[PDB]
């Protein structure tokens, strides 16, 4: 047992390791999406910039969980980071829809992790998830839904003019 | 009954007065530790300054609980502050080990207080403990673990050179 | 065929996708190394910061290859990022030795990629590798050699004092 | 023989004079495109500015080769600069397509020049072409590809708004 460990359940420790993997997976998906928009046959520089920003943010989400693991005296165990489900993300609209799906899946995992922290009477871990992750997820999901709504209303993905103008005026 | 009092259990009010006592006791332990390092036959000026800083922090912890008691309309009952376990703290490593033990003791008390607040459905007191106390304890405990590890690996307490160089390069 | 594609061999396009994977793997190795030094029972804060900096650098190496692939009109295919060889990196000296081995592995891959670019008479890809990668690897390898030498000469890994003082005076 | 001449093949010297002529030709094509967009019946001022910038850039490309010829002790022979293929470039999209074709033609000449310098074991001339020309061409080709993709996806040339909005939001 780590000299620092106190009120830290082994189940919570294993769950935090799985959350670190999910955050690194989310970073990877956003990295894939970013460079799709950098393609010469897609060429939406602000979609590329937006998703690269998201990719770097997911890496910081992972690093903060790795810090928490060591803070509580847990031990980090890393697994392969799986490739994203798509190589070609089709359109700005379809990428935003897939990003919204991703953020809701990450959110579901955080809520399962909170339920487990609640069941193991770990208020420090409850506070950590609430303070640093749950509202970040709500804001992310709201923002992506807003993006999806505007792109659909403007006539995306059939209107290449819609994706062009959204890229300039919302993401730029 | 105080005109402000709302959703505040007698048991929670009592538990806060016990916490105030423990925070003052912790302030007193770190004060004794500080001036042990100020002895001409110990003479580790940065260990002394480290533990005096910790002493002042514990007094601020006590004051914020006293403020909380009056915010909630509870009544402060102060008790004798027990003298520390040791007069002579033996070494840098032994003082850091006792500080780690002290911080886990205070953390255990905060976790029992949070369990009580949760049982009495006092979300304001739960938030207060989580926001102001629980991550402060985790950080304190991780830092003291880090310090114990480094001193042990350097060859303390048998190396007077180890504690000298740790005083200069880590606490300095 | 991409409208931009000119003098870019399928074999070079494939080799760039393998290089992107290796750069991401190297980022993942250095991330695991970083948080090993962040453990309460290792507690070498400058080793931790050193390896996290190296992790962020490898991610930037990957991104510039992804940009290159799209510049040349190749298509990015991402793969699973393999977990690092070790969960526990044992010591400062052992992590630096593994980092030196990692950097020579990445360097070997870049030299094989340059051999391919030379065979396919791709001067743009040759220049890209030489300008952005090959002297970065030589400098990384010389620096890690220097660090291994100093730690060995100081008495690591058996001196906890050696790794402590190297953390303070070289990585600090 | 020039007192400065060293490792400079007569074939290389002649190829440099041919490259000077092509760079001057490129400057002329861009000048022609620029003032097409300045017409009262075309009136796309940011298309006009973009192509004039490209014209001045190509003049710089020609002057750096003329400096190189003299640095190596070769002798400049200038020839008639051929008029561009068109007086009327028809549209923003069609001008960007012809510009993409031009940059690929200039890039091919530079790759043939590099092949000759390689065959003549002229590393100074290889480095000159790689450092100053090859990545400039890759960047120019990627940019024009991106521009062509955007104008196409916006609905150029059937869409009335597309060229107008691209001139404002991309080239402005
Ligand atoms: Fe995240
Ligand atoms: Fe306290
Ligand atoms: Fe690298
Ligand atoms: Fe040119």
From Swiss-Prot, chains A, B, C, D:
Record-level GO BP terms: immune response; intracellular iron ion homeostasis; iron ion transport; negative regulation of cell population proliferation; negative regulation of ferroptosis; negative regulation of fibroblast proliferation
Enzyme class, UniProt record, top EC level: oxidoreductase
Keywords: Acetylation, Cytoplasm, Cytoplasmic vesicle, Iron, Iron storage, Lysosome, Metal-binding, Neurodegeneration, Oxidoreductase, Phosphoprotein
Subcellular location(s) of the protein: Cytoplasm; Lysosome; Cytoplasmic vesicle, Autophagosome
Domain Ferritin-like diiron, residue spans: 6-155
Recorded catalytic activity of this chain's protein: 4 Fe(2+) + O2 + 4 H(+) = 4 Fe(3+) + 2 H2O
GO cellular-component term (any): autolysosome
Binding site for Fe cation 1: 23, 58, 61
GO molecular function: ferric iron binding; ferrous iron binding; ferroxidase activity; identical protein binding; iron ion binding; iron ion sequestering activity
Catalytic activity, EC: 1.16.3.1
Tissues where the protein occurs: Expressed in the liver.
Annotated InterPro entries: Ferritin (IPR001519), Ferritin-like (IPR012347), Ferritin-like_diiron (IPR009040), Ferritin-like_SF (IPR009078), Ferritin_CS (IPR014034), Ferritin_DPS_dom (IPR008331)
Disease: Hemochromatosis 5: A disorder of iron metabolism characterized by iron overload. Excess iron is deposited in a variety of organs leading to their failure, and resulting in serious illnesses including cirrhosis, hepatomas, diabetes, cardiomyopathy, arthritis, and hypogonadotropic hypogonadism. Severe effects of the disease usually do not appear until after decades of progressive iron loading. Neurodegeneration with brain iron accumulation 9: An autosomal dominant neurodegenerative disorder associated with iron accumulation, primarily in the basal ganglia. It is characterized by global developmental delay apparent from infancy, and progressive decline of motor and cognitive skills. Clinical features include delayed walking or inability to walk, spasticity with hyperreflexia, ataxia, dystonia, and poor or absent language.
Membership in a protein family: Belongs to the ferritin family.
Function: Stores iron in a soluble, non-toxic, readily available form. Important for iron homeostasis. Has ferroxidase activity. Iron is taken up in the ferrous form and deposited as ferric hydroxides after oxidation. Also plays a role in delivery of iron to cells. Mediates iron uptake in capsule cells of the developing kidney. Delivery to lysosomes is mediated by the cargo receptor NCOA4 for autophagic degradation and release of iron.
Name of the protein described by the UniProt record: Ferritin heavy chain
């Amino acid at each position: 047992t780590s000299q620092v460990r106190q009120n830290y359940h082994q189940d919570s420790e294993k769950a935090i390791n799985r959350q670190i993997r999910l955050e690194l997976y989310a970073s990877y998906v956003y990295l894939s999406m970013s460079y799709y928009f950098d393609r010469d046959d897609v060429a939406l520089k602000n979609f590329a910039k937006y998703f690269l920003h998201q990719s770097h943010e997911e890496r910081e989400h992972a690093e903060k969980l790795m810090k928490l693991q060591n803070q509580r005296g847990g031990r980090i165990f890393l697994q392969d980071i799986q490739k994203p489900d798509k190589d070609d993300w089709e359109s700005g609209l379809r990428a935003m829809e897939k990003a919204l799906k991703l953020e809701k899946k990450v959110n579901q995992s955080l809520l399962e992790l909170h339920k487990l922290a609640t069941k193991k009477n770990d208020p420090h871990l409850c506070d950590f998830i609430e303070t640093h992750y749950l509202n970040e997820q709500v804001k992310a999901i709201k923002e992506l839904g807003d993006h999806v709504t505007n792109l659909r209303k403007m006539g995306a993905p059939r209107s290449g003019l819609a994706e062009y103008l959204f890229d300039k005026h919302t993401l730029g």
